[model samples]
Every structure is written in structure tokens, then in C-alpha cells.
Target: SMEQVAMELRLTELTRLLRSVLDQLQDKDPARIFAQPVSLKEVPDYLDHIKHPMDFATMRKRLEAQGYKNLHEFEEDFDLIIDNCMKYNARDTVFYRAAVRLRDQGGVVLRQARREVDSIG
Candidate 1:
């Protein structure tokens, strides 16, 4: 029973962290993309719901084309986008937040995959 309780507690903690991330993003965009139920298999569809999907895709393509490996390298471009948003009275932090989330998630996914492979080998 205690092990079951511990497992449930850990699950709750994970859910809370996930909910908090989605809530904060909703504060900025209110898309509530993650507020609904999700399947890991459906992550790509959820990703499509982010604001300006094509624009973000284009940005990603350009970043990759330039051999950008880190967020610091994108800082100038991000600042330009933020400034442009302000100029047009757009939701300024949307691009910045998306970029941060992409970077954070990418790093976590890559690190976890490597860790798993190392454990297996």
C-alpha cells in the first residue's frame, strides 16, 4: 500500500508539473493546447496548435540551415522578433516562449534518449 501511495504521489507530481507548464503557456496565448487530454502519440498534432505554426516552422528551418546549435545563437533573432511584435502590437512573448519550450523539450528528449541507450548498452 505504501508503494502504491508513493507511485501515486509521483504521478501526481508529474501531472502537476505538466499542468503548470500548460497553464503558464495558456496565460500567454490562452490556446490551452495542453489543457485538454493528450496522448504522447499525438504530440505532433498538439504542436501544430501553437500560434503561427508556419512561421515557427520557417524559423526552425532557417535556424537549422544556419547550423544553429543553441539558443544563445538565436538570441539576436528572438530579440528582433520580440521587437517586431511590439511594433505591430502583437503578442510579443509568444515567439520567445515557443523557442524556449522547443529548446527545453529538445534537450530533455535528447538527453533522456541517450541515457536510455547508455543504460541498455
Candidate 2:
């Protein structure tokens, strides 16, 4: 339950902080369309889900639009999204690096409790 609790806490904290910041910057935005839940990771995955014949086609289209499409295409796009987010963060590291730092500090944190529980059983 700790993992879920931690995620919820992070969500709540992030939402609060984002809302506060949005209030300040709500007037200055003009170029990009505004959307709620402006997280980088959330956008691509969800975007892929809705694009075509489910995940495969959507992901494939994204890759093809960029001139190629393969399993690695999704991986590359996801990595770029994460990398940009981390660059936006205060410490200026890649999101993967940030994740590794958290995992090491948190004693090899499980990405999904259900996966670990299933594997152990």
C-alpha cells in the first residue's frame, strides 16, 4: 500500500503546486493549446491509446510520421518526453536518472506492487 500511497501523495502535492502556478501563469499563455494534467509521460501514453486501432496503430502512426515506426519508436519517444521533463526539473538530470536516484534512495522501489506480488506467487 505504501507505493500507492506514495503515488497518491505525489499526485496530490503536484496537483496543488501546479494549480498554484497555473493561477499565476493562466493569463500569459498564447501559443500552445491548454490542457489539464500537463505531464509529459501521461500525454504520450494516453495519446497513443486513442490514435487508431489501439496502442499499436497509434504508436506506429507517430513513428511513421517521424519517417519510421517500430517497437523502439515508442521507447525513443517516451525517453524524449521523460528527458524533456527532467530538463524542466530543478536539478537538470534526465528523468531516467531521476528515477534511478529515487530507486536507489528508496531501497529498490518496486515499479508496480502487483507485478512483484504476482511474480513471487
Candidate 3:
């Protein structure tokens, strides 16, 4: 029962986190990619990339070959994709786990966006 409860709790937290992420995505304005050009469409790719390449050093070569120089670079737009994944979900369970991944990755996205804006020449 404890294990079940723990799983349930984790799932619940995941759903809440996903909703929070979705709200931020909508706020970012996905409809207007021209104004905010970030590859929000390739979220699933980034998610898989981080889980494999960023999670372990052994896959560095693969990630580089795939064109990711930094984890933060992928986060910039992938976070929005994470948001869309949740928003498009028909079931909360799927969105819940994705939310956890997105939350961990979202910080980098936010930071990248901030850096891009601040680096104006």
C-alpha cells in the first residue's frame, strides 16, 4: 500500500507540474513562432536527447552529432514543446511523467531565453 500511495503521490505531483508548465507555454505564445523563434516543435526529440545524452557522458558524441552543443541550448525551445505535449494530452498520466522531465529541463530554457534577450548588440 505504501508503494501504491507513493506512486499515486508522484503521479499527482507530476500532473500539477505539467499543468504549471502548460500555463507557461501558453504564456510564451506558441502561435507566434515568428516573433519568438524557438523550435517548440522538436520537443520530443529534445526530451529523448537529454534522457540519453545529457543524462550520461557516454552519449556525448551522439548528442554532438545530432547538433546539440549544450543542454541549455536544447531547453530554449524544447520547454515549449514540453508544454504542448501536456496541453495535447488526452490523459493526465502521460503528461504527468513528461512534466517531471520538462520541469528539470525548463530551467535551462528560461535561462537561455533570458540570455538571448540580454545579449542584444
Candidate 4:
């Protein structure tokens, strides 16, 4: 019988890494924007500017559903989350600032996670 010891290491390490990365994004958002879906009711032109919008709350549910195959997919979604924010908001606004912080700080955590994920791979 094949032992799945290394399999579980990738499982927990990647999961922990992802959870940590997600926490920073929610924390970085001062306007609490990325926690949920975009409200087109407020910004009717949002979709017109950004086509693939992403947010932390949905990221959480995806993680809960075990949707990620590895760090790449989840990290890809994080990029989408940040890019959409920057794309939708003007450079001088708070939303852009928050998204910049998320991008900078979250990338630090994400790179660290990548190391752990890399360790197992």
C-alpha cells in the first residue's frame, strides 16, 4: 500500500498558507470593499471598466469548498482581486490605496507560502 505522508504535508501547508494570505487582504481593506461582491447599485460603471471582478468573501467560500488545486489558482485569484480594485478606482482614491497595500503586503505573505508549497513539491 502507498503511504500518503507527503500528500498530507502539501495539504495542510498549502491550506494554512492560503488562509494566512486571505486574512491580510480582508485586514488591508479600510473601505471593506473586497469582502463581498461589488455593488453596481453604487458604482454603475464598475463592470464596464473591469470584467473579471473578484473579492475576499467569495475567495473564502472557494477555499471552504476546497476549490484550489494548489497555490497557483488561489494566488491567481488574489491577483484578479487586486487588479480589479486598481482598475476600477482612480489612482488618488482610498480604494486604490487599500488595494495597493493588499498587493504589497499580501504578496509578502504569498511568497512565503509559496516557499512552503515549494518545499513539498
Model 3 TM: 0.29
Give the winner by TM-score: 4
* Pick by TM-score: 1 or 2, better one: 1
Ranking by lDDT: 4, 3, 1, 2
lDDT of 3: 0.43
TM-score of decoy 1:
0.27
TM-score for each candidate, following the candidate numbering: 0.27, 0.25, 0.29, 0.81
lDDT top scorer? 4
Off by over 4 Å in 4: 1-13
Q: Give all candidates' CA lDDT scores.
A: 0.41, 0.36, 0.43, 0.80
Question: Over the stretch 15-115, how does candidate 2's per-residue lDDT look in tens digits?
Answer: 44333333333222222222123444755564343222112233334433443222233334433433443443446444335533432432322233224
Error of model 4, residue 103, in angstroms: 0.8
Position 40, candidate 1: lDDT = 32
Per-residue CA lDDT of candidate 3, range 1-121, in tens? Answer: 9998876665554444333443454444333221222243855464443332121121223333443333344454455455544544444564445554555655655564545434631
For residues 1-121, write the lDDT of model 1, one tens digit per residue: 9998876665554444333332333344344322233343855564444332222333445543543333343334433433333433334565445544544554454455445434643
lDDT, model 3, position 98: 51
Model 1 residue-pair collision total: 0
Clash count, one per candidate = 0, 0, 0, 0
Q: After superposition, how far is residue 104 of candidate 4 from its true place, in Å?
A: 1.1
